[model samples]
Target chain A: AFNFSAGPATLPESVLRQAQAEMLDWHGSGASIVEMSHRGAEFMSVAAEAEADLRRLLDIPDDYAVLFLSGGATTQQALIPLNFAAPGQRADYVVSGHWGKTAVKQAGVYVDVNIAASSEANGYRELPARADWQLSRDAAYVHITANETIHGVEFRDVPDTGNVPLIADFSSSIASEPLDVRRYGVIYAGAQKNLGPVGVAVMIIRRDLLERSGQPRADIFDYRSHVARDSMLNTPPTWNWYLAGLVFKWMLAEGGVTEFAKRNAAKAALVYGAIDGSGGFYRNEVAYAARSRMNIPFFLPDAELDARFVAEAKAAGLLALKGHKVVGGIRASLYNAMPLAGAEALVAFMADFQQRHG
Target chain B: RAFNFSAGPATLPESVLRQAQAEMLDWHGSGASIVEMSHRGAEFMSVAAEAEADLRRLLDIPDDYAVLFLSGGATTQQALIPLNFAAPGQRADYVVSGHWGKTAVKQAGVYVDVNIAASSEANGYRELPARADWQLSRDAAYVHITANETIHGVEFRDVPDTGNVPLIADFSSSIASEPLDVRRYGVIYAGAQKNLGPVGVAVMIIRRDLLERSGQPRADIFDYRSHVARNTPPTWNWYLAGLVFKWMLAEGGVTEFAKRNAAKAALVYGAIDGSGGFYRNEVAYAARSRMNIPFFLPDAELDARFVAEAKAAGLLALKGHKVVGGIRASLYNAMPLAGAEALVAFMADFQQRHG
Candidate 1:
């Protein structure tokens, strides 16, 4: 059975099996990793390795810090702007779809979020191209969602903004492929989607962007105080951290993001190929170039068939193919853990179902 | 068997640990580890609900209080307490009795006008201040106290009377070890490391009316109101928490736990006090903790030797916190009286061999 859930979605089989193998005694400590002190040598080593592995996977430069903190990507959406921008400072945001609209609304509380580019008027059918952007000259940071999870859109190239640091929310699309880390000032993601469990989020911020004032923001949400303690400011999500470490180890064993990207590209093509080959029985609303490699959302000829389609898919051992409510038809999230076989099975199922109904 | 006496991320019952191991692969044959279960599904929702219900049953929590299983530990609450309760320019009273108390005060200082009503730092954190010594503010938002100081090894025997002002407590170390009146405080929160479960979760019991009165401008993550809604509370931590809550119930609730805990503390403290001039605990007898026992030898040089011998004998994590430089034997709930017996005997052997 394959889980296609949007987030908290899927985990690599080997990671799950390995976590189970050591759930009782990690390295014969006679204690679960959960039972170890966060400050203890055993757990601290787990965190150090998790950080080191993530840095290697992404080839993250030393100048950019990779902070393993909890509170989810939603927390990052606000905390990033809070750390980089002060009150009333202008933050340029791209409103591509669901997550982008969410970022703009969340960041508006602490800073003025100026709209840089938006494709909402077309029902988020395409990402607003880079040249269409209105980059702010003195903006605190330019914020964008690298992949719109709900709308099934991903911008292929990095936005070019001279002098201004760019922040990207890579929640749904991170590690699915290799990324140029230097192009963005900050990259953040929740762990549930492709990495590990849901209890934590990863924040990779450029070193120079970590600023301090005469009066520092003292809360843990303040990235300065948080990163000051090696992201162990509070008891981090320890089990999640360990699981994330196992995930990175598994990623390494299976060759790396380049291998993952090859699989991901084939998986995306298989599903999109099914839709395009359906001859009007299936259709994807997203622009061909802007379509996401990680998420593929498609529609049936009749909206009424959406529920039946999801029900039959679940019955076939393909889970949670129902799209998000605002874009309700079907969304297949092919995260790192989701294999191409799952996509093939769904496409085969879709062909059979369309033959009966259409 | 090695006894892990680390204060938090501490110890747990063998029964609880074994059950966790059995369920680690597939919970109730749900075909997923409790970790892999979705928050939107029934597999985790029932775990979340049962955890709250069992915890309430254990504490005899009142209906007026809302139970929240939140992430980010006690530091998050230190910020949240002031953010939720105190309006702009309002004062929040604090009694800083030890290291954890000072931390609470520091975090509260960021959000409100913090007045240290009473602090025992000047006395080397040896004893808690008397209730009469506290200077309560008439119009303050709330009075804060550390119910059990893990570092200083002091427990408040009496709750501070605040009259109309709501009271908040950081009970991270000694929650569920003994009984306390739920009505005496408006909020009581504990990190999951000590008596409860594990490190990644925190149990917060806040009065519902106090939430209604909190000032707005809240982040969805920071706001207690949003967590009360609990769309996606940390599912795995919540599940483990439920197992622990059930473990508490299956072990005859907190009443039986209080009696066993008392006996264990008596055993350890008896050894230290019985050592005469050889060993000493600086804390006042009236304020000594049942959960944590920090004591000293005649010479600081013997401290390392004491810890080394304890580890050799398989008594683990007996080293004290850096702030309180000595040996600490934390006898949390999962520590059987036998572990304490070994601890006392280990020290007695050390004293006789050295003397």
Candidate 2:
């Protein structure tokens, strides 16, 4: 059975099993990780190791500080501008889809945001050409979505912004591929996707960029505050942090990002090939170059067949493939732990469904 | 074996767990009681109802804007205040006595100018900075403090007079351990653990005008306005909060808990006194906390063996943070009186061994 909800999505079964095994007692301490203090030695080791392992996995440079923040991706939407962008300072944003546009709206609250380029007018079916982008020279930073989970668009290369810092919300693509950590000034991902459960957010920021934060900052939202306190200035989501550490360890044991990325590419190819061979019965409009390796959104020629298709798919143990309302059809989110067999099963189901309905 | 000294997300009463278990799979046939239902559902309506009612009965909260069960600890409130209180460029006052106060100062920096109204740095956090020595802002949006310093064992016996400036407190480490004048402060927030239930739920009480004063332009999740718009216990958190409230109510409420807490504090403090300079609590007597007790043994060398031997005897989580190297025994509401007695007995045994 394949469970493919977009965010707050599935995790590796080995990670869950390991966590469950140690849920009641960790390291023979006779106390669960959740039961220990954030400042205690037990949790400190867990917190430190998680950060260290994540830094190694991303190859995060010495100048960047990895912080565990909360309140989801939307919180960072407001927080990024509040911390980094000063009054009258402009920032450039690329609107590839819903998330990019949302970032623009949130950034507008604190700074002057120049929409460098947008693909919304084209129904967000493809990424806008980088040559068409009107890059802002005086902007504080350039922000883009590395992968659009909803619209199924992804950037194949980091945007070159000269000296202006580039920030990416890698919520869906993180840990699924080997990312060059030095290319961007800041990279943040909400834990619901590849990290762990909902509520915890991971922000990797260049230490130099943190010093340039604008005045009149909120105490809780400041990146430097989390950094100085070691993410223990206040009570953190302890359970979520524990689960994230478990996931990180699982990723390491499962051949790290190099191996994981290969599996992801192969799984995505298997499903996309099925869509391409459907003979007009099914369609996926995302351009081949910009298609997301994580989320695959597709449609049948007859929109009315969608409900029956979803119901039948669930009966066969394939679940949560229903697409977002803006683009109706089906979206199969193939995250890191989603086995290739799950994608194969989904592709097989899609083919059989098309034969019955076509 | 009867003691539960795990601080915050500590021990919840058995009866509360029984109620939660009964309602877990199916809640009054509305399908789910509280945990499984949406925050906007009718079933959650009752969960929100009973929880708030019990809280009001316990805390004696007067007719106010609302009682909110929010995600994120009191740390989140440091950001929430500026989101609600100060405009984009306004300033707020902070009183730093210990770890929690320092956190409030840092989190408030995300939205406003933070003025350290008072601090206990001169005395090494052995006492609260005298309220009279405070250099409060004339036009500040609010003044904040941690009513109980969980790490340093400091607490405020009296609320600071900020005049027109509203007073907010992070009461996470101490709420429902004693009766509080809810009308005294604009807002009071406590994460469940010390006196409430579990770590997930954070109980926040705000005055009606404070809720109205929340200026717009905040995220729907973090905004007090959006939570007020929904107006209920936040589902999963509230369900557990409601259970804790019921437990408090059954355990003779805060008044009973206060008497028990006072007795428990006295027992431990008395043992430290009887140790004849063998043990030392750095905090001045008047400013010491009735909940969290931080003490140092005369021989720092014996600290490891003391903690290890105590744990071997089933007295767990007694080790203090390495930052404040010594020992700390947090005796929260659910911490039975016997736990305090057991710690005293163990301390005497350890002192004899060391001597």
Candidate 3:
């Protein structure tokens, strides 16, 4: 069966089985990983291995901090601006899509969020071209969505923010391909997408930037406070963190992100080719250069067939093909765990559905 | 087989672990792990519903209480409590019994006027503060207490009388070991690592009337109202918790466990007290925890030998928290009576060999 959920997304079959084999007693320790103390030697090793693997996979710099924190990426949407900017301080934002606009809305509660660029009003069909962006001089940080899940647009290169620190909501596209971790001051993703499960999150921040987090919030809410303790200031989602390590190990065994990138490109090319070759029977909204390989939201010849399309797709072993409510259509999310065959299956379904109804 | 006595992220029933192991990849033949299920989907929704329903039945929860399954532990609860109840100038009363009590007071201090109604910190946490001496505020917004202290080996055998003020109990280590009166508490909070299941999720039961207490502006995730109204709640924790709840139901609820738990605590406490100063536990007789039992050897030098030999004998995590520097045996509900018996026998062997 193929899982194409936008998030809490598909995971490798081997990773799932690895976790299952170790669920009762991790490495024959007589206790589940979830049953071990976070401060204990056992869990610390798991946490360390996960961080190291993630760092290695992304080529993250030695000076960058890798934390397996909880509350998901949405929580960090607030934590980022709160930790970086004081009340009424300026923070620049790129409103590229639904999630990008959401970050702007959350940032507005704390900082004077400046819309440096936005493709929202422009039909969300294109990324805010780098040259068109009006970045801030000394804003706390420049926020952007590296990939917009609903709008089905993803950045092919870093937004031109000059020397300003860049913070990204990389929830939808993280680990799908290699990322330049050093380019951004902070890069975060919820574990649900392309990682392991839903409850945990991995946040990578420049070590020096942690110095500026505090004031107007409790220590529990402070990112610096978590950094001081190696993100054990409070209890973490142990099972999620532990399973995500298994996922990283699986990725490394599968020839790392370079292979994932190649496979993902191949998968995206197949589905996008199907859409382009549909002879007006299928359509995708995003500009070809800006399309998200992770989440490809496409439309049928008629909106009325959307329900039948999703229903038949499910009957065919494809799951969570429903697009985000903000954009009603079909979205086949090809995350890291999504095999090329899943997209091939989706393409087949699309062709058969169009042939039957076109 | 080893007996685990970890204070946090401690032991769980073997049957629960076995069930979890088998169901890891596919849940109810969905070909997807419960972890992979969509939060808003029917599969997870039913899992959450059953989990909540079973918990409410086991606890005899009233209609007025709102149940929430959330991540982060008692520390999160301490902050959330004040954020909801303590509007500025409203005094929050805290009964400082041990390590957990002091931590709650410190976090609550940031949100409201924290009143130390009672504290036994000066008394080395050997005994709980006398209720007669407590100077609870007349118009206090809420009174907070730790129902059980895992590290300190303290238990509120007698719940405090808060008169009209809502009482919030951090039942992290004590939840589900015995029945609790839902009407008496404004909220009862516990970390899942204790009596429920594993780590990450905390069981929070809040009185429905206090749901609106946080009022106007609050962080969406932190706000209780927002979580209740959200389209989808936290997923994996609730699913794990549901498994735990169903397991508890099959084991005949907490009422049955209470009897077994009482006997387990007795076997270990008897070993310590019966050692005739060879081993000592300073906690008051009545206030001593039926869940966590911390003991010291007369010859402090033998502490290292005791923990090492105990581990070799399959008694794991017997080493106490560093602050206490001794052996702390945590006998959660999941700890079978035989585990306690094995520990007691191991203790006798170690003492006989070392003493």
Candidate 4:
């Protein structure tokens, strides 16, 4: 069965199998990997190799420190302002969709969140035009969501912010394609989506940002301290980290993000092609340029048909195609783990269902 | 292989590990591992709910308490405890029983005016700070204590009365080893890595009334109320913990484990006391931890040799914490009495060879 969950999404079968193999005894260690201390030689090698593999996979620069941390991307959203901005300091946000709105809400407590640009008026059908953005002269950082998981809107291009750092939430679509690491000061992602399993997040922060005094916060919430300790500030999500490392190796073996990018493009096109050819029976509201390659949300002509489509899809071996309640439609998340054949199967199912109910 | 005595992230039951391995790829025929599903999905929601319910039943938590399964170990919660309960600049009483308690104070120091009400540091953390010696702060927000210290190898024999002030305890190393009076403490937090299940998740049981406290202006993610209302927990770790909870309940709950824990502790400690100074555990007998026993050889050379030989003989992670270097054996619920017997046998053999 193909799982189309928004997140924690489906993982590669091989990675899951490897994890299963290692679950009882990781490489002949007496205890399971999760049962070992993070500081122990075995686990320390695992932690370091994970970082090294990620660095190689992403082609990340030496100047950027990568942190594999506890909690989800939402925690990093709250930490961003606390680590990068002064108390009540202005921070620019481009609210592209649901997660972008969440970022603003999470940051508003510690920073003056200025909506530099928002597509809410447009029902998040498109990314806000860069020219329309009210850029702040003294903003601590300009934050954006690289891909909106629910709204199915993605930034096709990274918006330029001259001096203020550009911090992007890459939770839904990170590593879907090759990314320019230098363009953003910080890129944070939860591991559930393109990366791996849940319960951990990865942050790639520019070295210069570590020098900022930011604001008053606990050491646990401080980014610099985490970077200083090499993300071992406390017990990290080791299992998630290890799983993500396996995913990284899988991705690398599959010809890196370049190959994934091609596959993703093909998968997105397959689903979107089906919706477009639905003869007004199915629709995707997101503008062409703003469409997300990771998640594709489409609506059936009627609510009953939407319900029928989901039920039938599940019966057809496709799971979790139900859209988020906020966006009452069907969504297919084509993350790294989602094969092109999954999209073809969904497209095939959608066509047959439409003919039956047409 | 001999029993692992590493302080957490420590050993888990072989049965639990096997069950998890069996479900690693396809959990209950759902076509996905528990880790590979959304926390909000029905499959995982059931896992999350059952984990909490079983934990409540295991600990006998009262209805007035809210059990939160959160990421960022007990250390992170130490910081959140102050930010969520104490007003900014408000005084909070701290009883430093051992290393973890001191670490808690360090995290709390940034948020509140920390009053070290009592400390056993002067006695090298060999014993718990006397409850009678505590200088309770007037109108203090809470009294923080480490229920058990992994590094110092000390455990509080009983809960300390904090009068009206809330008693918040870090029970990381020693939770659920015995039946607990949950009503005695306002808050009980533990890193699940030790006795419970795995690392990367912490279980926090807080009094529901404390959620109303206007402690400080902090991020919503830092708010316990927000977590209680809407939680994005570490579902995988929580699920593993659930498996452990079910295992614990199936094995006759905490009472049976306590009996086993006491027996295991006695085996290790007995060997140490009977070693006639060949091996020594400096922790006060009454306060010595049943979970973690940090002992010493006569010299650093023997200590190094002991750890090497123990590992070679398949008893692993017997090396103590760097802060108090020697040998430490952590006998949690999963460590059967046989493991303790094996260690005791090794202890005697090592003394014979070295002495």
Q: Judging by lDDT against the true structure, name the best candidate.
A: 4
True contacts kept of each: 0.48, 0.35, 0.51, 0.75
Taking the tens digit of each residue's C-alpha lDDT, what string does model 2 give over B81-188?
777878765778889999878877776675677888889977778899887899999988888888999889998888778899889888887888889899999888
lDDT of 1 by residue, A100-152 (tens): 88788767777878999998888888656678788889798898889988888
Instruction: Return the lDDT, model 4, position A260.
Output: 90
Against the hidden reference, what TM-scores do the models get? 0.97, 0.84, 0.95, 0.97
What are the runs in model 1 whose C-alpha is more than 4 Å off? A212-216, B230-233
* Segments in model 2 whose C-alpha atoms lie over 4 Å from true places: A61-63, A196-199, A211-220, B2-64, B67-72, B87-99, B102-140, B156-165, B179-184, B191-201, B214-222, B230-256, B272-288, B295-313, B316-327, B347-355
lDDT, residue A166, model 2: 93
Per-residue error for A172 in candidate 4, Å, reads: 0.8
Query: What tens-digit string does per-residue lDDT give for candidate 2 at A260-283?
Result: 899999989998999898886678
Please tell me which model should have the higher DockQ, number 2 or number 3.
3
Scanning candidate 3 chain A in windows of ten residues, the lowest lDDT window is A213-222
lDDT sort, best first: 4, 1, 3, 2
Candidate 3 reaches a DockQ of 0.51
Model 2: lDDT equals 0.78
Question: What is the C-alpha local distance difference test score of candidate 3?
Answer: 0.81
Candidate 1 colliding pairs, count: 0
Error of 1 at A193 (Å): 0.9
Off by over 4 Å in 4: A28-31, A196-198, B29-31
lDDT for each residue of candidate 4 in B103-210, tens digit (9 for 90 to 100): 899888888999999999998899987788899987999999888899989999988888899999888888889998898888999875787757666889999999
| DockQ-based ranking | 4, 1, 3, 2
Clash pairs of candidate 4? none
Q: Rank the candidates by TM-score, best first.
A: 1, 4, 3, 2
RMSD of each: 1.7, 4.7, 2.2, 1.7
